Design a protein around this ligand. Structure first.
Ligand SMILES: Cc1cc(C)c2c(CP(=O)(O)O)cc(=O)oc2c1
Ligand SMILES: Cc1cc(C)c2c(CP(=O)(O)O)cc(=O)oc2c1
Ligand SMILES: Cc1cc(C)c2c(CP(=O)(O)O)cc(=O)oc2c1
Length: 270
């Protein structure tokens, strides 16, 4: 409660300058201290579901040996906008692991949709999240229909708190077996799309993995991350934004600034 009260005023100023709503939940996994701002509100997931998608693939790989090596072939009709890796292998195919890495590290849309199909669609990913104790997450649609980000629409949303809680379980807790857990961490650490978001608030000598999302309407974009400061326990945090008007633009700088405030609220110098 004390740290949440500590950052309420700066968060309100930040979201008023942004012109929308900012949702943050940050957890110090050492002390258990947390910072919350709109942490229970629903925000569109956008591409941030793709991280949980790769975790679901890894969970299944614990039950099905060789799943990660399975080649997947696809047609030109799979190549929806922003498929930067999968479009280069259209004439060849890619493995499940390569699709997962592309979905996490390049936010590749075709890769995400192909893996969603393997897992039974949006309801299958939602079922995985329920299995780890997340009752908030819901995926309803595919890329790119899930970007609609309609105000008040619960489809394809979660809350910052639920995102952080599930991310902790999958990267630091026991939701995945140790080898799969480290693979998930390694994919997040290799993400290329988040340099202007949470990472922009993280000192160079701290390890960080993240997954971004950008819906492109209603000022809606996000990032979640696990941060390993040196000499203390890791921090898990989620930063989500939205705004009232369809033509409102998202802001990467606002996401980075919100991450800075969350870390400052936890007393993590850096
Ligand atoms: C690779 C892929 C992509 C999509 C979008 C789907 C869909 C949704 P649609 O294409 O019907 O709009 C359902 C499905 O079952 O498989 C997919 C596989
Ligand atoms: C896509 C996916 C993956 C897994 C591991 C599950 C689990 C674990 P399961 O009990 O099936 O072994 C529960 C579930 O309901 O959905 C999933 C969806
Ligand atoms: C059409 C499109 C698709 C994506 C995946 C993006 C992303 C990557 P994401 O943040 O969703 O992971 C950033 C962006 O600014 O525009 C996009 C536009």
């Amino acid at each position: 409660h004390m740290l949440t009260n500590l950052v309420a005023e700066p968060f309100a100023k930040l979201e008023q300058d942004f012109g929308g709503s900012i949702g943050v939940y940050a957890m110090d996994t050492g002390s258990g201290a947390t910072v919350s701002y709109r942490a229970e509100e629903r925000f569109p997931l956008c591409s941030s579901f793709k991280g949980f998608l790769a975790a679901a693939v890894l969970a299944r790989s614990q039950q099905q040996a060789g799943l990660l090596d399975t080649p997947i072939r696809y047609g030109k009709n799979a190549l929806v906008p922003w498929s930067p890796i999968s479009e280069k292998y259209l004439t060849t195919g890619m493995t499940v692991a390569e699709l997962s890495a592309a979905a996490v590290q390049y936010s590749d849309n075709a890769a995400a949709n192909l893996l969603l199909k393997e897992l039974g669609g949006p309801a299958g990913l939602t079922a995985f999240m329920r299995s780890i104790g997340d009752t908030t997450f819901r995926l309803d649609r595919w890329e790119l229909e899930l970007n609609s980000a309609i105000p008040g629409d619960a489809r394809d949303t979660s809350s910052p708190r639920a995102v952080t809680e599930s991310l902790q379980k999958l990267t630091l807790g026991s939701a995945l077996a140790a080898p799969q857990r480290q693979q998930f961490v390694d994919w997040l650490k290799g993400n290329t799309t988040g340099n202007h978001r949470i990472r922009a608030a993280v000192p160079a000598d701290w390890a960080v993995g993240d997954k971004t999302g950008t819906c492109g309407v209603y000022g809606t974009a996000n990032d979640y991350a696990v941060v390993w400061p040196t000499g203390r326990a890791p921090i898990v945090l989620a930063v989500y934004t939205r705004a009232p008007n369809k033509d409102d633009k998202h802001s990467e700088a606002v996401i980075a600034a919100a991450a800075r405030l969350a870390l400052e609220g936890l007393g993590v110098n850096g």
